[PDB]
Design a protein around this ligand. Sequence first.
Ligand SMILES: [Zn+2]
Ligand SMILES: [Zn+2]
Lengths: 128, 230, 543
Amino acid sequence: EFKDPSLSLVVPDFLCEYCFFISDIDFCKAAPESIFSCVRCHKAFNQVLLQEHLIQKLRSDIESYLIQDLRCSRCHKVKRDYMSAHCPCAGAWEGTLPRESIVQKLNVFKQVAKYYGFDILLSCIADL
Amino acid sequence: YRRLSQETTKLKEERGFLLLLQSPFITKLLGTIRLLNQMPIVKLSLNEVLLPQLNWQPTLLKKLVNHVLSSGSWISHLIKLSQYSNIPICNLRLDSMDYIIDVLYARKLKKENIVLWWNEKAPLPDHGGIQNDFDLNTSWIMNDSEFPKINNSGVYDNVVLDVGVDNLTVNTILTSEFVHDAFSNDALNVLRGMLKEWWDEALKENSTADLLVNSLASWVQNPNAKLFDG
Amino acid sequence: VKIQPPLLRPLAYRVLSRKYGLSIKSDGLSALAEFVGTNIGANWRQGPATIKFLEQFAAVWKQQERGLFIDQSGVKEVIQEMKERRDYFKVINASQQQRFSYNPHKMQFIFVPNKKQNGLGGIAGFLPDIEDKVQMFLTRYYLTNDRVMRNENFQMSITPIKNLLGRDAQNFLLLGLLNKNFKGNWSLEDPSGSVEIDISQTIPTQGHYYVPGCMVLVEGIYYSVGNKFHVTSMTLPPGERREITLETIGNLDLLGIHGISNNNFIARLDKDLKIRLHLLEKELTDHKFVILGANLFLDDLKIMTALSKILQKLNDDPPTLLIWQGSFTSVPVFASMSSRNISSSTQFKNNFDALATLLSRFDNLTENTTMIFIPGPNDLWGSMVSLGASGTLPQDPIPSAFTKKINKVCKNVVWSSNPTRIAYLSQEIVIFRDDLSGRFKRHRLEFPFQKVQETRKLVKTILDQGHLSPFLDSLRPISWDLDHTLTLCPIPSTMVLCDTTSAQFDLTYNGCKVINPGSFIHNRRARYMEYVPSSKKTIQEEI
Ligand SMILES: [Zn+2]
Ligand SMILES: [Zn+2]
């Protein structure tokens, strides 16, 4: 059975001051000589800005996971009590954001930071 | 290393002129020499200059010569921008296009009856002090920046047209109580009229208006510019 | 003299297998052999000295673990013997704080294994699991209810919310989370159920900041016409002192410096407490620690000038602990959209490189005093996403990638979290940097009906509620597992309650003393405050 041999990590709305041009950028699927340069103009990007935006994305992901809501198992109603054992009906709460998704995202951040030379992002991970 | 003060003093007592300043440490150089506060100075910060560790003489010579012989064009452009934007000479920068938009929009709102919510040294709008508090709706509306896309796989034996769309944001802006996530429609209409007159002026042979309209979207995205709102 | 192991084996074996001890390994025999080699002489004819040295070995080794095996460490106990023939205080952050759960039905604190020590942690081990946010409010309610029940006055009995369904026209006493329901009315939440409240005729106990999210004792009459509990009075639960709080669990080593507890067993100690108290009673004036104001900025020249003026005064007489608190950058750091000027991260790195230069001319302070740094509201990690607004409370320390010169210039620097705990010989200190006055004033709940009283109410409320952040998840999101670090249980002796919106004060109440440092700079004056561990304060300023 065929699968996709690569994951995806996309940074939305990266701006090129030399063009005022807005587009996304895929750090995993896009080939080199295009991550470091604008699509239209062939002007090199600044690397610390890329690394800072990656750190921003990772921190926003962590905060978004930590601020998630709880959903019941059988019925998909939202938890509306600050403290309760479980749903009035049968079923236990589960989070909207699963753990495995963010674990895999952190793994792909590790892979991306290891492929290129990104010391600041490595130190960002190491502080956790 | 002490001759900078001597040169500045001799220039001060030899002529009353404007000074072009270009360095990554503008504030540090302003603080090192006390005579710099006594003259009108225009700053032209183009930082992030480095050395190739070898054969630096010709590259630095090229930098200096192009700077000195393009300062005329630079000051001509600055004069054009200042005499169009009703802003003094020393308060403008070549790349600081957002500042002009901010000041003119604030002036238009001041002639109106809407509070500016102006802010300094902080990339948040002024809401009376409430903005520093964490809130769920705000934190959700800052971080939802993903743009969806459509992809339908398959093999096509028919002809396919690859087209490109440009100036979508400006068209979206120009074209088109109960809801709490709504932005004040008064400001939206004000900026729509502003952009309409901007477009009309840029049509009638105005490079400055065209460049400013081009930079409008980058101003909208960038939170570093003042008068920003998520 | 190089010995033969066979002719030494019985001497060790008898003493360490028949009278006391057991299970001597081969490395233990080698360590004892080299010990005999050091204390060589008229041995194999000398009785008392060797056996009493073995008894001293037992008196050194029986306290460690259980002492039923002797590995390569035999040289380590030998060195312990050699060296047995200020210190004793530690500073701990919220990340490494020991984890202790709570159980209501047995009424004991329960140790929980640390995920850092037993788990792998190679990729992601800091992420709490789902049920922690379910159990955090349960734990807070359990602790509050136990504290209320232990009170002398309450031996009247409170009733659960759910048991209010069938009766009416009767008065009751209850307590629970006072908050807003989905509809928009004020309600009380209990592990059993919830009801609607009435405020139109409520007479409060003055001196308390009634904010949503704080446990409150409610008295009133239930009515079954609707679901309205007509309240007649509201009062925060009272407090308790450190000694009575401790004695219920003996003297637990929660902030254990002498010893630690684990899943296998629980520990206790009170014999050394009076020894350490008497040790503290002498040479305490020499062991002084000084703290400064908040929001000290490393970008403007005036703050650097004031800091230089302070350091030239402090160099001659270096204190023990110097605590730097507040935000070190006046502008929050975030994504930079300009590649023409200096990036925010590079500027943040540059702000600390100047401090390394300024510390080069104060070698006495650098050599004799340790440094403590505490993050503020808009440091690198927080303002990265919150953009200078309030956010998660257990803040990470200053990243190591931006302090690569301070650790080499100074021999003792420590970066801690926003809530940090230091354990002296007989003192424990908590430092908490954030704003409270505005937070309580703006969200104060209204009741239909000279600056020293505001801080009085603040202290009374924060000590009665017994939690650092008496707010719901909507206002201040909290990490799911680290909430135990914010719990105000076995309350500390002294609180460094730094606040930029409250005047400086030195209040003490209910066995706890609270100090409120202000901003480092104010009305063209610079102020920093030093606290003597003998319950004496001093305030000094330099223009
Ligand atoms: Zn470009
Ligand atoms: Zn259900």
